[PDB]
Amino acid sequence: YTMSLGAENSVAYSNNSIAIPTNFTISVTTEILPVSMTKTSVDCTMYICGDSTECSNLLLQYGSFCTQLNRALTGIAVEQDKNTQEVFAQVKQIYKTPPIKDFGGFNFSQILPDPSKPSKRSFIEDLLFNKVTKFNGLTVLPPLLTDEMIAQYTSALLAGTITSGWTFGAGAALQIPFAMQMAYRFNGIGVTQNVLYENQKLIANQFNSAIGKIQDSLSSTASALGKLQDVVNQNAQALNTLVKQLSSNFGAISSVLNDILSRLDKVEAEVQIDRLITGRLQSLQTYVTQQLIRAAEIRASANLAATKMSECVLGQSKRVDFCGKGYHLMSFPQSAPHGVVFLHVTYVPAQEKNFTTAPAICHDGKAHFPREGVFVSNGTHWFVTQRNFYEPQIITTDNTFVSGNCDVVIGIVNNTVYDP
Amino acid sequence: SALGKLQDVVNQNAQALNTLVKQLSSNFGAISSVLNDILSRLDKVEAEVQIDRLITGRLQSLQTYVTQQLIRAAEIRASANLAATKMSECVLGQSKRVDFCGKGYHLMSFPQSAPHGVVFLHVTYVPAQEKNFTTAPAICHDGKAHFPREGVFVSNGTHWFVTQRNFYEPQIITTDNTFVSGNCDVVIGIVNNTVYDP
Amino acid sequence: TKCTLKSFTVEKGIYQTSNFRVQPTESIVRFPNITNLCPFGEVFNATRFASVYAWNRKRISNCVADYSVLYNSASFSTFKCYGVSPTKLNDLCFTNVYADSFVIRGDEVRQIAPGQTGKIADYNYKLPDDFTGCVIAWNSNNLDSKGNYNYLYRKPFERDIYFPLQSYGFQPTNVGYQPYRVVVLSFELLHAPATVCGPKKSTNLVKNKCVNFNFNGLTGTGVLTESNKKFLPFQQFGRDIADTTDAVRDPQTLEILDITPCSFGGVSVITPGTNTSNQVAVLYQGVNCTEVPVAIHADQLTPTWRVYSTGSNVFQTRAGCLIGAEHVNNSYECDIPIGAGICASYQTSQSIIAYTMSLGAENSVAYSNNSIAIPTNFTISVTTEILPVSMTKTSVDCTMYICG
Amino acid sequence: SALGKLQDVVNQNAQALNTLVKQLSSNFGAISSVLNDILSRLDKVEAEV
Amino acid sequence: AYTNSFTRGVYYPDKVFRSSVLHSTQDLFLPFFSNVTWFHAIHDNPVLPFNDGVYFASTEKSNIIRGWIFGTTLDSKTQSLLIVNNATNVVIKVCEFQFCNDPFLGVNCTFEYVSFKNLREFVFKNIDGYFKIYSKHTPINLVRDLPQGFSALEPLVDLPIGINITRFQTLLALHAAYYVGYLQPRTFLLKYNENGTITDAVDCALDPLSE
Ligand SMILES: *[C@@H]1O[C@H](CO)[C@@H](O[C@@H]2O[C@H](CO)[C@@H](O)[C@H](O)[C@H]2NC(C)=O)[C@H](O)[C@H]1NC(C)=O
Ligand SMILES: *[C@@H]1O[C@H](CO)[C@@H](O[C@@H]2O[C@H](CO)[C@@H](O)[C@H](O)[C@H]2NC(C)=O)[C@H](O)[C@H]1NC(C)=O
Ligand SMILES: *[C@@H]1O[C@H](CO)[C@@H](O[C@@H]2O[C@H](CO)[C@@H](O)[C@H](O)[C@H]2NC(C)=O)[C@H](O)[C@H]1NC(C)=O
Ligand SMILES: *[C@@H]1O[C@H](CO)[C@@H](O[C@@H]2O[C@H](CO)[C@@H](O)[C@H](O)[C@H]2NC(C)=O)[C@H](O)[C@H]1NC(C)=O
Ligand SMILES: *[C@@H]1O[C@H](CO)[C@@H](O[C@@H]2O[C@H](CO)[C@@H](O)[C@H](O)[C@H]2NC(C)=O)[C@H](O)[C@H]1NC(C)=O
Ligand SMILES: *[C@@H]1O[C@H](CO)[C@@H](O[C@@H]2O[C@H](CO)[C@@H](O)[C@H](O)[C@H]2NC(C)=O)[C@H](O)[C@H]1NC(C)=O
Ligand SMILES: *[C@@H]1O[C@H](CO)[C@@H](O[C@@H]2O[C@H](CO)[C@@H](O)[C@H](O)[C@H]2NC(C)=O)[C@H](O)[C@H]1NC(C)=O
Ligand SMILES: *[C@@H]1O[C@H](CO)[C@@H](O)[C@H](O)[C@H]1NC(C)=O
Ligand SMILES: *[C@@H]1O[C@H](CO)[C@@H](O)[C@H](O)[C@H]1NC(C)=O
Ligand SMILES: *[C@@H]1O[C@H](CO)[C@@H](O)[C@H](O)[C@H]1NC(C)=O
Ligand SMILES: *[C@@H]1O[C@H](CO)[C@@H](O)[C@H](O)[C@H]1NC(C)=O
Ligand SMILES: *[C@@H]1O[C@H](CO)[C@@H](O)[C@H](O)[C@H]1NC(C)=O
Ligand SMILES: *[C@@H]1O[C@H](CO)[C@@H](O)[C@H](O)[C@H]1NC(C)=O
Ligand SMILES: *[C@@H]1O[C@H](CO)[C@@H](O)[C@H](O)[C@H]1NC(C)=O
Ligand SMILES: *[C@@H]1O[C@H](CO)[C@@H](O)[C@H](O)[C@H]1NC(C)=O
Ligand SMILES: *[C@@H]1O[C@H](CO)[C@@H](O)[C@H](O)[C@H]1NC(C)=O
Ligand SMILES: *[C@@H]1O[C@H](CO)[C@@H](O)[C@H](O)[C@H]1NC(C)=O
Ligand SMILES: *[C@@H]1O[C@H](CO)[C@@H](O)[C@H](O)[C@H]1NC(C)=O
Ligand SMILES: *[C@@H]1O[C@H](CO)[C@@H](O)[C@H](O)[C@H]1NC(C)=O
Ligand SMILES: *[C@@H]1O[C@H](CO)[C@@H](O)[C@H](O)[C@H]1NC(C)=O
Question: Residue E68 C-alpha to ligand 17 middle, in angstroms?
Answer without folding.
Answer: 27
